[PDB]
Write a protein that binds this ligand. Sequence first.
Ligand SMILES: Nc1ncnc2c1ncn2[C@@H]1O[C@H](COP(=O)(O)OP(=O)(O)O)[C@@H](O)[C@H]1O
Ligand SMILES: Nc1ncnc2c1ncn2[C@@H]1O[C@H](COP(=O)(O)OP(=O)(O)O)[C@@H](O)[C@H]1O
Ligand SMILES: [Mg+2]
Ligand SMILES: [Mg+2]
Lengths: 340, 335
Amino acid sequence: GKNIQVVVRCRPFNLAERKASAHSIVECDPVRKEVSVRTGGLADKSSRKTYTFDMVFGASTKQIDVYRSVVCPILDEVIMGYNCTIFAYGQTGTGKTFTMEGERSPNEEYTWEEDPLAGIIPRTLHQIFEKLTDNGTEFSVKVSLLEIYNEELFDLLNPSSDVSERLQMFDDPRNKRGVIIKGLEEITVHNKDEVYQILEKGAAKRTTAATLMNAYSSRSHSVFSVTIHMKETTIDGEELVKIGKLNLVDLAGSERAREAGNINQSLLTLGRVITALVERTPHVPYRESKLTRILQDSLGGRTRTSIIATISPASLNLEETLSTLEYAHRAKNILNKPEV
Amino acid sequence: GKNIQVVVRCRPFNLAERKASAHSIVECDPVRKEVSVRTGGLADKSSRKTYTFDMVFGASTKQIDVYRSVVCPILDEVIMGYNCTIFAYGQTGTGKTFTMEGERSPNEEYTWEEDPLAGIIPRTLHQIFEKLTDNGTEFSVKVSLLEIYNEELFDLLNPSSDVSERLQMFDDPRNKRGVIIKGLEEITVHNKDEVYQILEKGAAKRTTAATLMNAYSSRSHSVFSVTIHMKETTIDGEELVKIGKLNLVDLAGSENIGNQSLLTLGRVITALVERTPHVPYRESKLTRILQDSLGGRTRTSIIATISPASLNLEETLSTLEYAHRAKNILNKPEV
Ligand SMILES: Nc1ncnc2c1ncn2[C@@H]1O[C@H](COP(=O)(O)OP(=O)(O)O)[C@@H](O)[C@H]1O
Ligand SMILES: Nc1ncnc2c1ncn2[C@@H]1O[C@H](COP(=O)(O)OP(=O)(O)O)[C@@H](O)[C@H]1O
Ligand SMILES: [Mg+2]
Ligand SMILES: [Mg+2]
């Protein structure tokens, strides 16, 4: 048992894999919580590696089910006044952004209920407003969106100023763990719907940075953070002031010279940090990377942390799929159970 | 190079690339025969990267243009009685098979006019029958189709034989440059479009092999060889006996670089272009089977296919470097 949870989500086939005559090599067993991969080469149909995780989601798993099993328990902790983090890890094209943000799909004007393709960020903001409104709590909601590319922090919500200028990050006088990112824009969200316009502004800026600086999303880490100030009151029950925070991280693809070197280095540090938090090993290498330094005040002070590892089912991507499963296995090691 | 030609064919964006709002990072200039890749963001950048080749084919290039430009001169030499080869090299999904055999229109074939989607293989077979009949040449055509996977040969046209059966090569006593592929099926072609029927049998065999032997086509080399026996008679002229051969190779996906067969082919080509002492023909089964071609009097051509999207920047750059190393041409002045 842990406050740290590692799960795997397999996506369905894409057109390119079909056209290449790829074959299915992944088998997902949600009940036993295992994923098995056929790794055979020429004339080898008998070899297949099996891994076990906290949860396993197959190709048919819907958005709402990932939200209910993974995010719900975590948002509960946040509402109680804690700081938590959720990561999306995997090869480019396997579903990280689909999982973290989701899509709207052409159909027009959305009621109030959640779009079936909506991701974690959208559903999270919707629930915060719904839950806090229903219980009479006095609250305020603000979000921020920064991107880490080539080890440099870029604000994706700052209206003006936009161009290039990095943002400065330095340890601030106060109790340890935290850091201060000066200038980082913090947009106040007034209603549950307002989350979609905010994302747009972010996406638009994201594109400008990719085109005029080659800061492609597939090669950068996206940190979307939501902070909640809460104050509830009950007659004959004292008043409580709480502050909660949830970091939703869409990591760079796991598959220039150092540009990719730093990426591999940032992801590997994250692995070191996680595996460390799982084993209790005093001292975790937070400082070894910009990514882990920014989320330090989220991973340290006890809280729930989850990692969603996305993979492809196709033979054409055997190598990266195995790499992703290995990385996930290293983060939190859980033995396979008997009876195949 | 002279007889060795290296060209580039960039494909159009695909659905996945659009839906991801991918950025076009390659520019193809057919007139200057250059390919440029944007590696810098264009606000700082490290500048583009320009390569020059014998020909560059943009995204709008149609099948008939590639044929008219790359194949015609080559088939002319084949009909003269020579051995030639054409390769399609590149990342899975860039157009190797679309280029080498093409596709068929889901409906109306218009029997007499080549399906616009027809690739090099079908067009070639059709032109062979048309040209030799028109000049009254006595001739016969035969074809073979094999795939190489993890250095093992598999016959795709042998109706019998189980899937796990491989072919064994042997040195040909009559020619040091040649090889004998024992038991390789050579189907006689009696008329034009009968090529499609033969291509289907091979595809069915390839599917079986993928299923029962894990020989995935995206990780294998496919070698289609057509042999033409010719006897041309002209009263008051000369009586010519000829044998022509054309090998059409659809290579394994280039992302497979990182077995070594692709690097051995690259080295063999570089050596032929730069005329260096020894050509490493024997360092791979692919170059060994094709040694009879590539050598002696022969025109050789490599069609390198690429993607224009930022999503495949990595593999596209790799392909361009491989193509440049095979035959290095100096960039003209930025003029
Ligand atoms: N679980 C899934 N269900 C449906 N489509 C998915 C799923 N995972 C991935 N996809 C598809 O794959 C594409 C690429 O994944 P998306 O997340 O952009 O990027 P990445 O995997 O690089 O984060 C999307 O267009 C989407 O249709
Ligand atoms: N130049 C091109 N013109 C038209 N379609 C192309 C071109 N290049 C690629 N495509 C399309 O992209 C896909 C490429 O797959 P394929 O032809 O199998 O080649 P790759 O062999 O190198 O796997 C096919 O769907 C094909 O129709
Ligand atoms: Mg993404
Ligand atoms: Mg192909």
